Amino acid sequence: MGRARDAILDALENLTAEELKKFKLKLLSVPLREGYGRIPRGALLSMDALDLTDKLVSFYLETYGAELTANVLRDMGLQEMAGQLQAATHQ
Amino acid sequence: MGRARDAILDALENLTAEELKKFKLKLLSVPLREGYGRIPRGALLSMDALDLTDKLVSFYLETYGAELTANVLRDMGLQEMAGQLQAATHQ
Amino acid sequence: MGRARDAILDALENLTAEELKKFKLKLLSVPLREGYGRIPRGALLSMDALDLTDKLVSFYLETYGAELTANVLRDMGLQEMAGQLQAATHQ
Amino acid sequence: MGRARDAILDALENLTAEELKKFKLKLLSVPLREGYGRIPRGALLSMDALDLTDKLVSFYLETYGAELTANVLRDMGLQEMAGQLQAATHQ
Amino acid sequence: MGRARDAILDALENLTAEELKKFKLKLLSVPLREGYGRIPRGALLSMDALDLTDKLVSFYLETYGAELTANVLRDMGLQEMAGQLQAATHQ
Amino acid sequence: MGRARDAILDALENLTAEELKKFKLKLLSVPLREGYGRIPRGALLSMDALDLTDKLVSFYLETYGAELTANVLRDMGLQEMAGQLQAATHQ
Amino acid sequence: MGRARDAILDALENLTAEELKKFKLKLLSVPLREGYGRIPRGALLSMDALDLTDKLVSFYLETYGAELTANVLRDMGLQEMAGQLQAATHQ
Amino acid sequence: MGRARDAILDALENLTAEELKKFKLKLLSVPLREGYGRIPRGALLSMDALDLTDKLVSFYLETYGAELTANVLRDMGLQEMAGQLQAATHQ
Amino acid sequence: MGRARDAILDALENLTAEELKKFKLKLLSVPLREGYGRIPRGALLSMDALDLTDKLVSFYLETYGAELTANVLRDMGLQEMAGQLQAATHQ
Amino acid sequence: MGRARDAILDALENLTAEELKKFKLKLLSVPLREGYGRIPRGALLSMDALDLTDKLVSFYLETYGAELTANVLRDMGLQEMAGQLQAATHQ
Amino acid sequence: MGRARDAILDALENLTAEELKKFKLKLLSVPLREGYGRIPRGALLSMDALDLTDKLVSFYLETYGAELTANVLRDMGLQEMAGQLQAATHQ
Amino acid sequence: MGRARDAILDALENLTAEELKKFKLKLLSVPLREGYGRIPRGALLSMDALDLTDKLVSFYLETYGAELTANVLRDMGLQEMAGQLQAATHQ
Amino acid sequence: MGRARDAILDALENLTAEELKKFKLKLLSVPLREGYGRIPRGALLSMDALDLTDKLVSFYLETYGAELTANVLRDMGLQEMAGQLQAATHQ
Amino acid sequence: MGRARDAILDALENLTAEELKKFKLKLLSVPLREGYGRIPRGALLSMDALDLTDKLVSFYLETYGAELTANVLRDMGLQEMAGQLQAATHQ
Structure with a gap:
């Protein structure tokens, strides 16, 4: 399995x-x-980090899941985590 | 079979x-x-979302079930969910 | 033979x-x-769906059997099944 | 047959x-x-609602069964269900 | 011939x-x-309802058979079937 | 079905x-x-607003439940909420 | 016959x-x-209450069967059932 | 049957x-x-109030069950409940 | 026989x-x-994964069963399992 | 001889x-x-698979028996057994 | 007789x-x-372990039966039981 | 019969x-x-306390069964039940 | 059997x-x-420690199971636990 | 039973x-x-006072459990509670 879930x-x-x-x-x-x-609101507004990662890799794929997470992280301002995630995913 | 259960x-x-x-x-x-x-109170206060939808579509009909759900959602305040449900059901 | 048993x-x-x-x-x-x-209590409280349908059509005629089943189903609130049964039997 | 079992x-x-x-x-x-x-303790501690109603109407007659159920419900506090039961059975 | 066998x-x-x-x-x-x-224990512990009724009416008389069955039903707790049997047999 | 539960x-x-x-x-x-x-302490000291309303309407009736809630709210000082509840319930 | 089988x-x-x-x-x-x-282990671990009572009264006598049942009931802790059984059997 | 189980x-x-x-x-x-x-530890650490009352009245008797419950409640500090139980049981 | 049941x-x-x-x-x-x-509602709402797969391959054929499962999985959002299911069944 | 019975x-x-x-x-x-x-109900509701096949091939003919059982299997939902049966019987 | 049935x-x-x-x-x-x-599906979906072993050794021979059981166990994931079976069978 | 089964x-x-x-x-x-x-894994992972005791006394004798139970209880940490079992069994 | 499951x-x-x-x-x-x-995702995300150990020793052998557990523990950060596991397993 | 658990x-x-x-x-x-x-970390870091007392008196005996609790309490500085525990335990 791909490492994108990590x-x-x-x-x-x-x-x-x-x-x-x-x-x-x-x-x-x-x-x-x-x-x-x-993701439905009822489940989304209660998951912790682990369930969030699992469901992100579930609904979307590994590549699109990583891209969406990076885009959201850059949207809210945090670019250190977003940059680290992009570096880990791309290569 | 009607799609209003979804x-x-x-x-x-x-x-x-x-x-x-x-x-x-x-x-x-x-x-x-x-x-x-x-719906009897014994089972109403224990069902989750899925069982609730099933029993709502079973007890009432498709059209009346959707209408009753929209009216209840509108009564309790949530105006976005009721609007989305009416848009999905009417057309 | 009549199709009301189905x-x-x-x-x-x-x-x-x-x-x-x-x-x-x-x-x-x-x-x-x-x-x-x-229907006697001893046998009624143990039959499954198939035996129940067979006994309902045997004890009661096809028309009255279907009508009684629809009435009982509508009494307990399950009206989707009752409407389906009435539509199937009347025409 | 009397309606007290309902x-x-x-x-x-x-x-x-x-x-x-x-x-x-x-x-x-x-x-x-x-x-x-x-009612023996061996079964009474595992019976569900439907079996409980059946055994209540079987051991106890219709009038006394309804009266005993109303008295027990009133004893434990719930006087809405007790009121509904009395209204239904009395007239 | 006696109707109480029924x-x-x-x-x-x-x-x-x-x-x-x-x-x-x-x-x-x-x-x-x-x-x-x-009734000997060997055959009694294997009969169904029909054989039980036949043997009950054979060993005892019609009136005593009905009375004994009603008494046993009353003693075991079932007070509805016993009352129904008494109503059927006395008149 | 009375509206006093709402x-x-x-x-x-x-x-x-x-x-x-x-x-x-x-x-x-x-x-x-x-x-x-x-209402017993063990349950009462743990229910939130929804279960509390359900229990209040269950143990007492609609009229007495509303009257008791209004009286208790008046006792603790809140005159705005008691007035609103009385206005809603009376007419 | 002896009533201790009851x-x-x-x-x-x-x-x-x-x-x-x-x-x-x-x-x-x-x-x-x-x-x-x-009592053989093969049959004992499968009998229900009725077969258990019948076999208990068959293998042992009336008095010894009742006494053994009372002793075993006391051994497992249940003393209310043992007390009522002794009260019934002794006189 | 005694009322001390209540x-x-x-x-x-x-x-x-x-x-x-x-x-x-x-x-x-x-x-x-x-x-x-x-009472065995395996079942004692899992029962709720209802099963606890049933087991208490089962292992011990009415009088000793009430007395033991009162003594335990007094020991653990709660004097109001112990006094209420003693008043209800003694007379 | 076909491998799509796996x-x-x-x-x-x-x-x-x-x-x-x-x-x-x-x-x-x-x-x-x-x-x-x-699939009848009575049996569908009680099956586990194994019975569900067996019935899915029973009512619908190999190809249509796989395609319907993929479509339903896509509809609820899970496009990771749907993707691998399509990859396995197509070739 | 015709192998449709197989x-x-x-x-x-x-x-x-x-x-x-x-x-x-x-x-x-x-x-x-x-x-x-x-086929009369007296035998139909008691036969197992083997004598059921024997009776189907006896009452009807090989071709008509196969066609009838295929139609019944199709109607009750099982489209996999019906397909293989048609494939076997047709050629 | 071979020991593979064990x-x-x-x-x-x-x-x-x-x-x-x-x-x-x-x-x-x-x-x-x-x-x-x-193995026909009608009987296969109801046998326990013992009947399953008997049918496996009857339909398939000792060596092929053991090999097929090992392969099926391997495919479903369990590689501890499969290794034990291979060790017991080969030598 | 030894008492080690208790x-x-x-x-x-x-x-x-x-x-x-x-x-x-x-x-x-x-x-x-x-x-x-x-003890085979299939039955071991589903037996309750009573079945576990019966099978322990069946497979292993009284002395070895008690000794093995004491050793397993000691190894898993519980030094109180192990000591109680040793005291009850040894003398 | 090997001690690696402990x-x-x-x-x-x-x-x-x-x-x-x-x-x-x-x-x-x-x-x-x-x-x-x-391990299938459906069952993996609900098992506790005991079931997890059982499945780890089931799918993977003792040596590989312990090695994989140590590798995962080191991957997720816990170095004390992985060191203890390696010390217990290697000798 | 000893009072050290209190x-x-x-x-x-x-x-x-x-x-x-x-x-x-x-x-x-x-x-x-x-x-x-x-005691394993998995339970030790989540148990409350009551579970802690139960597990302390279970894993260790009464005397050693009390002595170890007193030693740990004295180690962290709290000497009033340690002295009270020693006074309660020794005499």
Whole structure:
């Protein structure tokens, strides 16, 4: 199996309990590519980091999951974690 | 078979674990059209979203089930979920 | 032979294991027209869906069997199955 | 056949699994008028709502069964279900 | 020929597969009037409802058979079938 | 189905979590008219607003439940909420 | 015939299925007086309450069967059933 | 049947979940009179209030069960519940 | 015989107890081609993964069963299991 | 001699006992061509797979028997057994 | 007589009932060598471990039966039981 | 008949459901004396306390069964039940 | 049998519930040696420590199971636990 | 049974939620006498005062459990509670 389910985790474990809430909230309205579903609010607003990584790799694929996570992280301002995630995923 | 069972599921899965309890509680006293039964309290206060959608579509019909769910959601305040459900059901 | 023995089966097979028990219990006290016997308690509380349909069509005629099944199903609130049964049997 | 086997069911399905256990426990020590037996503890501690209603109407007659159910429900506090049961059975 | 042979059947067909065994067990120890024999344990613990009714009406008389069946049903707790049998047999 | 179950909820939702504890505590010693039970401590000291409304409408009736809630709210000082509840319930 | 075949039932029927298995297991190692056989393990671990009472009264006598049942019931802790069984059998 | 099985419940429902664990823990080491068994630890640390009352009235008798519950409640500090239980049981 | 009965299992065994229920629920209303029956609701809402795969390959053929499972999995959002299912079945 | 009795046999042995009862029940109401009799209920509701195949090939002919059993299997939902049966019988 | 009928048993008795169903399911679609028949689905989905071993050694020979069991165990994941079976069979 | 089948039960009944699963798991890898068999994994991971005691006394004799139970309890940490079992068994 | 099933357990019981979730998550994407299967996601995300150890020793052998557990523990950071496991396993 | 399971509780309920964590942490490294096991981290870092007392008196005996608790309490500075525990235990 691909390692992308780990590189996401290392990016979502560096977020404090305050930035994780913001990440989950931003995940509710980020534009999505065609053919991909959206996580329901009831489950999204209660998952912790681990379930979030699992469901991100589940709904989307490894490549698109990593790209979406990086885009959301750069959207909220945190570019250190976003840069680390992009570096880990690309090569 | 009507697709309104999926529309109700897509609306009841966007409610938090606390809003679902409110929905189930309001379902106990909402006025009902004549000839339609009322869900017993013993099972109402224990079902999750999936069982709730199934039993809602079973007890009432597709059209009346969607209408009742929209009315209950509108009553409790959530104006976005009711709008989405009405848009999905009407056309 | 009449097809009413198949419409009842398609309706009693759509009930979960808990609703079938309720159906069998309510079959013990539903009002009956004159000239029609009542299913004994000893055998009724143990039959599955197939035996129940067979005994319903044997004790009661096809028209009255379907009508009684629809009435009992509508009494307990399950009206999707009742409407399906009425549509199947009337025409 | 009398309808008392139904009005009891509607009383026992409107209370959750938590106080159904309390109802079954109270049924072991409720005072009984002479000539009526007591439900054995071996089955009473595992019977669900449907079986409980059936056994209540079987051991106890319709009038006394409804009266005993109403008295037990009133004893444990729930006076809405007790009121509904009295209204249904009395007239 | 006596009609109460039917009524006993109507009383023993309302017993599920469980309390029929209990009825047969109580038939081995119920007190008996003088001049009446006891059913041997070898064949009693294997008969169904029909054979049980036939042998009950054979060993004892029609009136005493009905009375004994009613007494055993009353002693084991079932006070509805016993009342129904008494109503059927006395008049 | 009375609407008094919804009027109480609106009364128990506009008060903060700090005074919900005070309301539940005052509910333990409020005088009660004869024939009505008292909610046990073990359950009472743990239910939130929704279960509290359900239990209040269950143990007492609609009219008495609303009156008791209004009286308790008036006792703890909140005159705005008691007035709103009385206005909703009376007409 | 002896009535102790009934009282024994009244002891083995008011205990749950979880402790019936414990009773049957403990019946395997209880000491016995001389001249009395032991119930075979193959049949003992499968009988229900009724067969257990019948076999207990068959293998042992009325008095010794009741006494052994009371002793075993005391050994497993249940003293209410043992007390009522002794009260029934002694006089 | 004695009513003391009802008083004990009224004493075990007036203490919160945290105090129930303490009660069950102190029940593991309270001194017992001779001839009375001790509840096994495996089942004692998992029962709720209802099963606890049933087991207490089962292993011990009505009077000793009430007395032991009162003594344990007094030892663990709760004097109000112990006094209420003693008042309910003694007269 | 065809190997697609193994791939479907490999897709249905990667779902937790929660989205398996969603899969079963959405299997009740997915559009079907002509000549293909619909799984009865009574048995569908109780099967585990293994029975579900067996029945899916039974009612629908190898290719259509795999395609329907893939479509349903895509509809609920899980496009990781759907992707591998399509990869396995197509070649 | 015609080997259609083997195709019917190995088609009816690929379905569980639960589906065999459904097959036997639906055999009671399937439409029949003129000149062909109907299997009586007395034997139909008791035969196992082997003598069922024997009776199907006896009452009807090889071609008509295979066609009828294929139609019944198709109607009750199993499209996999029906397809292989048609493939075997046609050529 | 060969001992492979025992080595298979020790392999099919050391796995829980959850993966016994998986074993029986995968036995329906595993590739088979030429000249070897397939176990009918009607009986296969109901046998326990002992009947399964007997049928495996009857349909397939000792060596091929052991080899097929080892292959099926390997495919489903369990490589501890498969290694034990290979060690017991080969030498 | 030895009493060691009881001392084991008292040892396996004073430990909660969490330690019972650990006990059963450790029973799969404990070193065994020569000439004694090992309990198969299929049945071991599903038996409760009573079945576990029966099988322990069946496979291993009284002395070795008690000694093995004491050793397993000691190895898994519980030094109180192990000491109690040793005291009960040795003298 | 080998002692390796005990070394793993002691490693998995010394990490809290939050690290067990991380361990089970990293078990979904760890590289695997050829010929070894992967634990299905549906069952993996719900097992506790004991079931996890059982499955780890089941799918992978003792040596590879311990090695993989140590590798995952080092990957997720815990170096004390991995060192203890390696010391227990190697000698 | 010894009273050491109570005095230990009296020493652990006088600890606020802060130094209880310190007590549980220091319980992970306190030297142990030979023959006694160590509580795993998985449970030690989540158990409350009552579970802690139960597991302390379970893993160790009464005398050693009390002595070890006193030693740990004295180690972390709290001498009032250690002195009280010693006074309660020794005499």
